[PDB]
Scaffold this active site. Structure first.
Site, PDB file in Angstrom:
ATOM      1  N   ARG B  50     -15.904 -45.123 -56.120  1.00 20.17           N
ATOM      2  CA  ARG B  50     -16.653 -45.851 -55.054  1.00 20.17           C
ATOM      3  C   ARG B  50     -16.860 -44.899 -53.955  1.00 20.17           C
ATOM      4  O   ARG B  50     -15.857 -44.507 -53.020  1.00 20.17           O
ATOM      5  CB  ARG B  50     -16.526 -47.066 -54.591  1.00 20.17           C
ATOM      6  N   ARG B  91     -27.197 -54.521 -35.157  1.00 17.40           N
ATOM      7  CA  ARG B  91     -26.115 -54.446 -33.945  1.00 17.40           C
ATOM      8  C   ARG B  91     -26.773 -54.921 -32.543  1.00 17.40           C
ATOM      9  O   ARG B  91     -27.881 -55.043 -32.477  1.00 17.40           O
ATOM     10  CB  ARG B  91     -25.663 -52.776 -34.141  1.00 17.40           C
ATOM     11  N   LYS B 239     -25.779 -55.930 -54.430  1.00 14.94           N
ATOM     12  CA  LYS B 239     -24.602 -56.486 -53.562  1.00 14.94           C
ATOM     13  C   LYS B 239     -25.243 -57.826 -52.868  1.00 14.94           C
ATOM     14  O   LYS B 239     -26.164 -57.820 -52.105  1.00 14.94           O
ATOM     15  CB  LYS B 239     -23.995 -55.592 -52.495  1.00 14.94           C
ATOM     16  N   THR B 297     -14.410 -56.531 -51.899  1.00 17.45           N
ATOM     17  CA  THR B 297     -13.608 -56.727 -50.475  1.00 17.45           C
ATOM     18  C   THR B 297     -12.501 -57.951 -50.821  1.00 17.45           C
ATOM     19  O   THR B 297     -12.571 -58.811 -51.487  1.00 17.45           O
ATOM     20  CB  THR B 297     -14.732 -57.450 -49.638  1.00 17.45           C
TER      21      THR B 297
HETATM   22  K   LIG Z   1     -20.987 -49.504 -47.702  1.00 16.93           K
END
Ligand SMILES: [K+]
Ligand SMILES: [K+]
Ligand SMILES: [K+]
Ligand SMILES: [K+]
Lengths: 494, 495, 494, 495
Positions: B50, B91, B239, B297
């Site tokens: 990855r 952000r 994702k 994760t």
């Molecule tokens: K990423």
């Protein structure tokens, strides 16, 4: 259908309409010993209070007992009272100046020769275990001071002495407990302290015993004998803590009233990935036996000092529920933590989430298929009552069982609705607190009579169901009771 | 039988005779970017490399790609190469004095007005997301800085500006990440820097894209468009990182080649107990669809810096496998940890334990009970082939599929043995690295001929199972192939 | 689903779209010995011609053989040729004036003493059976002259002699066959005549043997040995005729290639209601074994002289089919009856009616559930092919099997469609005529080659299916064949 | 398990431990009308006495009824008493010279014109049925004299008269019976003589009517109307005798209390192979509905005059039982045969053999798989009770039902043990004689009290199973009762 089909049709954002079937055991400590604190816990979701007898004198625990009974009474709640035994131990001997400092990379001799009991040094000290060098091998490990100091056994020096490698800095002090991972050790089922403690437990009317370090069926029989005639109705939950326990589980289950999976203890001896699988096996075996199984240690530990756990921890609680555990246990999180109420509340929510994500019909079918034919009348009646719940879609199941037996038998078949047990014994109310799905309700036969035609216990059972919001008029219940526990009925709620 | 009956008859102390079916995705970084470390990872059990494109430049990733292909060629391995996009990003702006201390019960004004970007105060600060006032409503929530700061929106002050209630104490610093739980977030499928990443990717012939923060089927299509004609064969793995994505799972799955359950991101927005259940739902839907699913994760995190993970972590990984995940992914553990090899070896071990503790037959039945009658030939042939593996106890299943389609279709049905795929395409070898149970073997048609009667590819596949230790002479294999889609099965003795 | 659900959804007046799966065996006699007559039978639905060797010399049967082969050739048909053996017998001796009259209520002594062989009277005569009075008990029965004369055994007189009661008038004549119901009798597996007859059968190239009076597994082995090396590919169908046969059926099945249920013979010994159940057991056992079973005797008897049977008779044929019989056999109805063609046609119709009223899926599932795991590759492939037929709804199943083995294995799993077997042997074509569902088609490898890539046998198989109206372009077939019988394919017809 | 597996594990030479579940209906006539012969029949195994009202006057049948109740009271037996109606009837008129010889290829004119009733010739004769020209069309068929004469209708000559083709040689005599295969026959449900029979029946308190030649649900209703208020509790068992009836089976079943498959009559009109299948269909539909079905005619006919039946006959009877029939009926065999007792004993034996050769569990499952989820309480309770009999191996099932409803409902589910029904109604005892597996026992509430808590009726039922030899102390029984419909089960040890 299937768990697979249940998952794909699940709506994860829709409200849960189910009611909490799993039960929570809380350890009592400094955070939680007061009447008020204990009420908080009860309101939060505690079903069973666990006295940890590894610490605290009889008077310490007498306080827990009294304050818990004061709290339960105030709230009109039946709470289980559990004595968790210290168990046998292996202790070190003494040291000059009462302690010694060890360093990562130092060698130290450990000996079972008593000549060294009183005179331990950085270089050599005593462990109170006569068969030391018959038991622990080179390349094997010893852990001391609740698993904190790690020693790797380098070699056998003689018949009393091993040479070890120090893996980590620790300051070791008088008479600490030892771990001997991977060994059949020669320790009794109960210690002499255990004997005093069980005696006290019987005098104080505890509901159940969490028996430490259970390795064989005979050891369970020794706890049974300790408790004696006067304590013949106290439940024994055998704590499985090591390879022997896991190896002997069939016989231990047979002899016990239930099982506690002590994950952290197992994880000292056994690779973590094998503890995960041990947990599965042990839980499934209890399900199949219709005996309560409790998942303990390493549950939501980080919530002892943080206001939220890690997802991993949350997942681990969820999975015990998915595995088939009746109960999940809290330790330090309630015993000495900052957020005892919040953690218990959070456990409850997790349980409920996982319950709702389980296809209970699948476990019902699975247990059912284990049953040999012919069944006994009592198995047939309970499994038939549960089958009826699914078939007419009843929203509660009522059993009249004075001992709780049929409540446990029903529960074993995993109905998708709550179980109410009307019983004449408060003790039965407290003991059913470790059995999935069950709400015990107390029928006072001294006040209201023997209720030979059952009319009053049925009515009490139904009222209990209404008042908890499980049913309304028009819903179906299934009722199991004795004739003049072998009668079943299917009723409409009025 | 049943999972329950499998459990009670299980002995944890017996040796395991099975061969690992689950696959391991490793993130490359400084710990593991060298040829020598990549060979370590491969030997340790990496199937997919990855490239995390949140970080590093093209040159840095080019080194990854060049080193990976040097490493894989040395060991004769097929390794999936995956580009994981940065994606769109919310952000904050800058604060005066470098940060601000927000106490619970405070109110603060958050604004999408570009004039406050550099002058955030305790009173008012910038968030880069122009449709803020539109997509977050009073009563809605804004999470900042990995989800640790919680803000309840009280009201819209103007079109730029929301008045928020501070729920919990936090020190907030320059340009921390924001999340909008529950909301339809109006960011593009692919950022501008994502298009340049994709572009680089297609140039270099990557095998798959890990597409960040996918919320709708249409967004998957946008990623499809961006790879364009040249990149048409690259797998898209969407994702799932938030509420909308979970909600739109059926569409996203249908549009994608597979799914990655991004637990940490999900957990920012969704309560942790619902991430557990969300993961189950996603995996099971991928299972049904016969598309690969990767759990990512928060896997064995503590093992980034410690030689050992916690039992809870190990449990978490095992349960991803029980849920039905094809793959599990390592992040920092391999990218920057001290024990890259050891973590991978340990994952492989966990995977294999969990595999052994699973009743595969039950998942076969569950999948099979869902097929409509009558079946299509290809569906009947693949499920029949997997049934044969159970009935005669064959020890590998061989599938001839150049594109990889039938191998994916066979893996859907969960045989309890390995699946060899004989393919004429190297790309297919690398693409199959994310499919449960599959070892691809390359048939070089230029050297050996077109093999019209399949006999050469069948022998290649048998040899592959022999080399790998799956079968010996006298064992049985099951074979699937065309005579389009697969329409023939064989049952054969290994010689 | 179920037979129950099949019945309730059945439309009894809707046309049947199924094709006849069951097979008909016809006895050849005076009515049916000509080329023309044999063609009639073939057109009517005969699959197997049975030579009854209880009567007729070798030259009589040579005529059947020749005329049947002439007829089959004309019609382009593969017909099975079956030799049905006379079997051992127990004969009476002689009488003065060649016969004697007996009356209902008379006593008569029967003796195994040979001194009486030549000199039988109303009062005393000889039966050629040395262990007579060790075998037949008082209250037991003896039947003589194809079961016509009934004697009840009153008492043992001595070791050679029984006193009997005459139940019915009969005129008894030289050397008639005897029945000894309820007795283990001491007779060989084959007679000396049988040996000559099997020898002839092997020289003439018969396809199968109907072995009379089979009582044990070893007796079947004796028929196997009789047929010898030269006849090692002739099928033996063991005829079950009595209690020993029924008792030993497992071993007899193992040893045989198939079974014939001889109902009338069984009904001499065994209560009729138990023959019904014997038929069920015997048929089910063959199904489970994947070996052909033939139902014989007492089939449509009344149609021997009437143009229509009774419903009871019709029902009895239907039920053999429902029971699971591959085949139903005609005896006198074709051998010597007035309506040989019509009765065969009528059998065919009954078969077809019952086929259509059966839920085949249920029998498929039932056979399947008998299978031990692991299966062998060859079982797995055939049961998997049949499973595929149901799953994709194929309208024919094609097997390439030179011996017929896989055709028999397929058939055993009861697909709901026809089975075509492409074979290189005409002998296989003739032998498959007793296997349910099967149409054999002959591939001439001498003309068309070895067909290593199967292309030509598949194509021949498909053409056969098209030309019988089982499939059209667009339909699905399942094909089972060897690689370079372990390959299955699922194809569209083009 | 399965019928197949039951078969292969069966030993025909083991003794049978079962108790007869199937019931025998006997026709009374000269062989069996005396008190003494009725006691023979009862002892031999008759449950129901059939009065055939085609023949005999009221006085003759009154003797039957009086003798039957004398006989039944002596032996303390509950015997169903059934009236079987004559019904409507199509007959020809008279012929000159007493009959006519019809050869195949002949044509003949048949007329419904009353002026030809007494002068039939080879050319033209009378058939009593005025709507003849309307309901039989060209190409339609007329069968005469037990179906042996077949006529194809060529054309309508006038409204009275059809021109017919003679298919087959036959000598035809005065007033033979006619059938109209395939046709909607326009005769009334009940003839005028049927109303007088019914009337007599209700006066005498019969238990059930066997209603001839029922073709539609509405006709069942007409029979219901004719029994009127007084006869409202008498069971109606509809006789299915022809094509229309078979076609209308769902309606007829819903309107009736049960069904009789009249094979001989069916076989006149329908080809014999379709009677076999028709019987299966009718029985299975009655099974599903939980209503009794009786197989009648052509049972053990040869045993009317011979001591032995043929194997085919025995097979026929056995297969009625395998099909799922509650009852089998004897006609001439008992009414006029030489071996009344022996035929009944033999039927009982056949029934019991077939019972033993049946896998009852398979029929239980088949019935149970057809219930919709969720079930009603009564359905769940009865099926659950039968399931318990299998699970604990109880040896009788006790049901408390005054009307008999739950006993019928329990028998639907096919327990492999006897069913005792405790009822307060004598009529229910007699009505239950046609229900598979059931022995009714009478609770005399006037003598023993109302038994509100059921304890007395439960003991009565246990005692009944003890007297009958079904159970001993230590065996298990299953009990069903109300606390309306049945809503409680028990499982008990016999004491
Ligand atoms: K990423
Ligand atoms: K403890
Ligand atoms: K013969
Ligand atoms: K009548």
């Amino acid at each position: 259908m299937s768990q697979l089909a249940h998952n794909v049709n699940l709506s994860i954002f829709e409200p849960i309409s189910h009611h909490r079937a799993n039960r929570i055991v809380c350890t009592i400590g400094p955070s939680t010993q007061s009447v008020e604190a204990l009420k908080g816990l009860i309101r939060s979701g505690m079903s069973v209070a666990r006295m940890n007898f590894s610490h605290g004198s009889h008077e310490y625990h007498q306080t827990t007992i009294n304050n818990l009974r004061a709290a339960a009474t105030e709230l009109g709640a039946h709470i289980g009272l559990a004595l968790d035994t210290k168990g046998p131990e292996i202790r070190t001997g003494l040291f000059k100046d009462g302690g010694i400092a060890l360093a990562p990379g130092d060698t130290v001799l450990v000996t079972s020769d008593p000549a060294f009991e009183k005179i331990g040094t950085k270089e050599k000290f005593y462990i109170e275990y006569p068969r030391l060098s018959i038991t622990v091998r080179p390349g094997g490990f010893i852990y001391i001071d609740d698993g904190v100091l790690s020693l790797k056994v380098l070699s056998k020096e003689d018949e009393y002495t091993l040479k070890c490698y120090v893996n980590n800095a620790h300051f070791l002090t008088d008479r600490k407990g030892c771990n001997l991972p991977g060994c059949e050790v020669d320790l009794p089922a109960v210690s002499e302290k255990d004997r005093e403690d069980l005696k006290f437990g019987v005098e104080q009317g505890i509901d159940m015993v969490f028996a430490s370090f259970i390795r064989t069926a005979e050891q369970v029989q020794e706890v049974r004998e300790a408790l004696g005639e006067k304590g013949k109705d106290i439940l024994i939950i055998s704590k499985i803590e090591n390879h022997q326990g896991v190896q002997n589980i069939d016989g231990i289950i047979e002899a016990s009233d239930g099982i506690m999976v002590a994950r952290g203890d197992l994880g000292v001896e056994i690779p973590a990935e094998k503890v995960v699988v041990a947990q599965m096996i042990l839980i499934s075996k209890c399900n199949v036996a219709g005996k309560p199984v409790i998942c303990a240690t390493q549950m939501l530990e980080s919530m002892t000092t943080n206001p939220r756990p890690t997802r991993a921890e949350v997942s681990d609680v969820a999975n015990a529920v998915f595995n088939g555990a009746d109960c999940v246990m809290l330790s330090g999180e309630t015993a000495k933590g900052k957020y005892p109420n919040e953690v218990v509340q959070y456990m409850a929510r997790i349980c409920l989430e996982a319950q709702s994500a389980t296809n209970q019909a699948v476990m019902f079918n699975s247990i059912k298929k284990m049953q040999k034919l012919p069944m006994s009348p009592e198995e047939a009646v309970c499994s038939s009552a549960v089958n009826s719940v699914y078939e007419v879609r009843a929203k509660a199941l009522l059993v009249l069982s004075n001992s709780g037996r049929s409540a446990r038998l029903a529960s074993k078949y995993r109905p998708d609705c709550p179980i109410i047990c009307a019983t004449t014994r408060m003790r039965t109310c407290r003991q059913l607190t470790i059995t999935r799905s069950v709400d015990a309700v107390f029928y006072d036969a001294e006040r209201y009579g023997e209720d030979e035609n059952k009319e009053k216990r049925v009515q009490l059972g139904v009222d209990c169901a209404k008042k908890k919001g499980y049913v309304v008029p028009g819903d179906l219940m299934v009722v199991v009771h004795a004739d003049h526990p072998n009668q079943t009925r299917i009723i409409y709620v009025s």
